[PDB]
C-alpha cells in the first residue's frame, strides 16, 4: 500500500529507491499510481511551455514555470534549453559546424563519459534519407557521428521483444520476452504489454545494462518514463540529473519516445502524414543537444541515437483468415497479425491437433501470404524456439499482409521476419568514444550490449553479441579479444588398414603401388586455417587432392570438409558406373566408419556427399569423392536440394565471385537451443546403426572482398556468405517443389541464409583462425549475414 499523502518536495525525480509504504517521486510512479499527491504540481510543471522567449530573460525566478530564463538558471540546471540561445546570443548546436572530438571534454569532476541513449519507437531505417530537411539535428548526429545504413532488429520485430534485446544482448528466446503478448504454460499466465504482470519480475531474464552498471558500481538514471510523462520533461529531466553533485551523478541515461512507431502505425511508413512526428523528434534531438550544449557537456557525452523496429505498409485488405483453412477456429487461440502463434484456447486440451492443423496451412493456395512452420523448423537465423512460452505452431507472415483467426484504422505495421528491409532500424553512435564521420556496415542489435559496457568501462553479462565485432565502431574503449582455445587436437592417419579388413558392405568399380600426403593440400583447399575443434573428441584430418575433411569418429562422418572451386573450375557427371560406388577408407578404421548396408537396409534415409563429385578436378581424384570418409546421410527430399546446390550452384558463385572457397558439414540440434548437441542430444540414426542423423547442413563460401582477386590468391579482406539448411524428409517448406529445382531450391536457401557465428554454435568448431586479417575484422565477418535484400 502506499501512503499518498506524502511529499514530492525536493524529492521530485529522484534516484531514490523507494517503495511501501512510502510516497514516490520517480519517472516510474505514476505507473504503480504510487506518486505522492503532490507530484504533478511540483514535478509535472507545464507552466509557460518549454523554450524561453525574449520577453523571459532576466526574469524573476518563479518556481512555478516549467523551465527557467532566470539568471540563476544555468547553476542550478533548469535553463529551458535554449536559454542562452534566446537571451545570451548563443547558436543552436545544430548551426554550429561539426569538429572532431578527439578526447572527451569534460568538466572537472567527470571521470568518464556520461552515455545517453536516445531510443524511438518505429523508426525506419530508411527514414533517415530525409535528411536535414526534416531532421537537422538528427542529421548532423549521423553525417558527424559514426553511422550504420541500418542496425538490424530481433524476430519478432515488435517493441519489448527488441527493447530487452538492446537492454541485454540476448536473442528474446534467451532473455524471455518472445513476444509483445506471451503465454507462460508453467505460471499458466499471460503477459500483456499494457496490465499488471508485466510487472511482475518473474518474466525478464537476463542483466538489463542498468542493472549490470549499478551492479558495477556504475549509478544509471531510469531507463522508463510513465507514459504521461512529455518528452519535454524527459529531455530537461536528464539535462538537470547531469547537474547533480560529483557524488549523486548519473553515468548513464536513456530517453525513449513512442513516434515515429504511432504515426507510421496510422498512416503507413511512406504516408505523408510522416514528415510532421519526424520533425518533433528532431526537436527533441535539439534541445538535448541545445542542453548539453548549454552544460558545457556536447563534447563530453556519448549519444546513442536508436530504434527497436521498422514499419512496413499493411492494411486491412491484406489480412489471411485462418477460418478460410480451418474448420473450428474457435477452438485455438491465435497471437496474430505481423506473425502467428497458435496453441489451443483450453490450455493442454487434448484433443488439440496441430499436425492436422499445420497440414490444412501448408500451400492451400497460391498465392498464400504466410507459411506455417512447428518451431525447429523456422530458419536457425531467427533463433526463435527454445522458451517454453514459444507456441510449436508459427506462421511466418509474407510482407505488408496480416493472419487473422476469423472476420481500416491502420495502414502501417511491424513485427516481420527480421532480414526483412522494412522492419530495419536505425543507429548513430555521436561523441568522443566514437569515430568521426565514420560509415559502418550493418550489424544486429544484439550487439550493442557488448559495446554499450564497453563505452561504460562495465564487463557484460554473458550474452549473445560477439565481443569485438563492433571494435570498429569506436576510437578507444575498444575491447581486446582473443582467440578460444583449441581442445581437441587432429589426428593425422596414414595408411593403417587392409581393403580386406573391411566389411561394410559397400561395393565400387575401381594400378596397384599407385594406390594423399599434406604436400599443397593444405595452402589450396583450407585457405584459413583448420577450424578449431572446442570440445572434447576425436577426429583426423583427412587430405585429398581435391578437398580436405576433418573426419570424427565419433559421429561417424566428417565435421567439416573444406575445398576451393576456382573460377574456371569444370562441372564433371558422375560416370554410370559409379553411381552406386562406395569406397572404404584405409585411413580410417572400419570401426570408425559407416556402412551402406544401414542404407540399403533404411527405406527412407538414402546418403550423400560433403565434397561433390561434380567438381572433381579428374577422373582419378573423382574417386576420393566417394570415399565412404565423405559421405553423409541424407534424406531423397534434401538431396534434390544438395545435389543441385553442389552441382549448379557453387560453380554460379565461382563463376561469380572470381572462385570460392567451400566448408560443408553436418550440424545436430536436436533440442533446438541453437547449440551443438552433445551425443546424448541426438535422436535418429541411420536404420539399425550407430550413424547420427544431423538435424541440418551448413555450408559457408569464402572469397576474396576485392573480387578481381581469385579466392586463393586474396591480400585483404573477405566476402562470406553461408546457410544452415534443415534436414528434413519432405519438401513441405517449398510450395514449388514439385518443379523443376531451378525453381525453388535457391528460394529455401536464402530463406535459410545464416551468420559464421551461427554455425560455429551449432557446430563447436572456430572458423578463420589463421588469416591476414586483424582478429576484430575476422569477428566482423562471422557476425555477418548475406541477407538477399
Ligand atoms: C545466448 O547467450 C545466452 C547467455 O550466455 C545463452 O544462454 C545460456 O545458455 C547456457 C548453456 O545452455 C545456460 O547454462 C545453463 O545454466 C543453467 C542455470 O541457469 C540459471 O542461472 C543463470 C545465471 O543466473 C540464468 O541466466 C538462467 O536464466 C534462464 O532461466 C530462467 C528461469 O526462469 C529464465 O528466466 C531466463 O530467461 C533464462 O532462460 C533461458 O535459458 C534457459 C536454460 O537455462 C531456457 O530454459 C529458457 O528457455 C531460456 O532460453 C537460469 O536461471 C544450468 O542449470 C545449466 O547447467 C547445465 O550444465 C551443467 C554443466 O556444468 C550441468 O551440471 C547441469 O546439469 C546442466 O546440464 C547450464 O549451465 C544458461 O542458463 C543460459 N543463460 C541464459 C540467460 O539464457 C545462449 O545459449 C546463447 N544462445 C546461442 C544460440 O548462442
Ligand atoms: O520510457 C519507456 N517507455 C516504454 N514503453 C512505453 C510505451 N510503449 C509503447 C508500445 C506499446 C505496445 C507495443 C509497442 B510496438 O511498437 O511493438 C509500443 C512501449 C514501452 S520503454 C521506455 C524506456 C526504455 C526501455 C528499454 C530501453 Cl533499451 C530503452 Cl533505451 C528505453
Ligand atoms: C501517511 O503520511 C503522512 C505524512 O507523512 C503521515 O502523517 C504524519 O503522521 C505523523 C505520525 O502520526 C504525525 O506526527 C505528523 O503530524 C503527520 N504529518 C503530516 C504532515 O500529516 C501519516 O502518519 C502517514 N500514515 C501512515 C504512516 O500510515
Ligand atoms: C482441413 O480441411 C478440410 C477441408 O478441406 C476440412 O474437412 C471438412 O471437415 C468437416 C467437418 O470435419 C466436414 O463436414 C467437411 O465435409 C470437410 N470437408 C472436406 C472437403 O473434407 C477439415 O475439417 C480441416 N481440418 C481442420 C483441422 O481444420
Ligand atoms: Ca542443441
Ligand atoms: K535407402
Ligand atoms: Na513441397
Ligand atoms: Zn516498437
Ligand atoms: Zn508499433
Known sequence: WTNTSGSCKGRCFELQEVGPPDCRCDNLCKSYSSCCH?????????????????????????????????????????????????????????????????VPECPAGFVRPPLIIFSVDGFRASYMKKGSKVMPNIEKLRSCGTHAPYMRPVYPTKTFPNLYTLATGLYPESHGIVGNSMYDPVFDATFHLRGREKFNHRWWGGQPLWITATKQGVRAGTFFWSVSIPHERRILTILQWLSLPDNERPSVYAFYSEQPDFSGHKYGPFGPEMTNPLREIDKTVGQLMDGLKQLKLHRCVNVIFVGDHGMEDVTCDRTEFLSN???????????????????????????????????????????????????????????????????????????????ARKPCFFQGDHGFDNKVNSMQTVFVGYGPTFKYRTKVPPFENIELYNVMCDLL?????????????????????????????????????????????????????????????????????????????????????????????????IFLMPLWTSYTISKQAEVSSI?????????????????????????????????????????????????????????????????????????????????????????????????????????????????????????????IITSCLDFTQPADKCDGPLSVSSFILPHRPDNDESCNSSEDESKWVEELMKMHTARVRDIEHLTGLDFYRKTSRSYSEILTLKTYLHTYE
Not at 548563443?90 to 572530438?101: A, G, R
Request: hydrophobic letters at 30%; charged letters at 25%; aromatic letters at 10%.
Open 457 to 553: 568501462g562495465l564487463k557484460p553479462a554473458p550474452n549473445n553479441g560477439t565481443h569485438g565485432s563492433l571494435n570498429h565502431l569506436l576510437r578507444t574503449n575498444t575491447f581486446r579479444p582473443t582467440l578460444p582455445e583449441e581442445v581437441s587436437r587432429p589426428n593425422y592417419p596414414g595408411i593403417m588398414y587392409l581393403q580386406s579388413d573391411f566389411d561394410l558392405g559397400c561395393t565400387c568399380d575401381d594400378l596397384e603401388e599407385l594406390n594423399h600426403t599434406k604436400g599443397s593440400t593444405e595452402e589450396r583447399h583450407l585457405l584459413y586455417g583448420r577450424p578449431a575443434v572446442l570440445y572434447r573428441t576425436s577426429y583426423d584430418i583427412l587430405y585429398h587432392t581435391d578437398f580436405e575433411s576433418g573426419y570424427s569418429e
Open 325 to 403: 483453412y480451418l474448420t473450428n477456429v474457435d477452438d485455438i487461440t491465435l497471437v496474430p497479425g505481423t506473425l502467428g502463434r497458435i496453441r489451443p484456447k483450453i490450455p493442454n486440451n487434448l484433443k488439440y491437433d496441430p499436425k492436422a492443423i499445420i497440414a490444412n496451412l501448408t500451400c492451400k493456395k497460391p498465392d498464400q501470404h504466410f507459411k506455417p512452420y512447428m518451431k525447429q523448423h523456422l530458419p536457425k537465423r531467427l533463433h526463435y524456439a527454445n522458451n517454453r512460452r514459444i507456441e510449436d505452431l508459427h506462421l511466418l507472415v509474407e510482407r505488408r499482409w496480416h493472419v
Open 575 to 699: 560416370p554410370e558406373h559409379l553411381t552406386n560406388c562406395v569406397r572404404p577408407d584405409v585411413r580410417v578404421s572400419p570401426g570408425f566408419s559407416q556402412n551402406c548396408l544401414a542404407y540399403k537396409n533404411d527405406k527412407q534415409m538414402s546418403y550423400g556427399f560433403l565434397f561433390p563429385p561434380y567438381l572433381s578436378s579428374s577422373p582419378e581424384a573423382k574417386y576420393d569423392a566417394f570415399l565412404v570418409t565423405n559421405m553423409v546421410p541424407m534424406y531423397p527430399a534434401f538431396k534434390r536440394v544438395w545435389t543441385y546446390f553442389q552441382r549448379v550452384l557453387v560453380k554460379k558463385y565461382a563463376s561469380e565471385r572470381n572462385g570460392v572457397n567451400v566448408i560443408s558439414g553436418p550440424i545436430f540440434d536436436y533440442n533446438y537451443n541453437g547449440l551443438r548437441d552433445i551425443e546424448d542430444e541426438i535422436k535418429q540414426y541411420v536404420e539399425g546403426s550407430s550413424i547420427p542423423v544431423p538435424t541440418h547442413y551448413y555450408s
Open 38 to 102: 503532490d507530484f504533478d504540481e511540483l514535478c509535472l510543471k507545464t507552466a509557460r511551455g518549454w523554450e524561453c522567449t525574449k520577453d523571459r530573460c532576466g526574469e524573476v525566478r518563479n518556481e512555478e514555470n516549467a523551465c527557467h530564463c532566470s539568471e540563476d538558471c544555468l547553476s542550478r540546471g533548469d535553463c529551458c534549453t535554449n536559454y542562452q540561445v534566446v537571451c545570451k546570443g548563443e547558436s543552436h548546436w545544430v548551426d554550429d559546424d561539426c569538429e572532431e572530438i578527439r
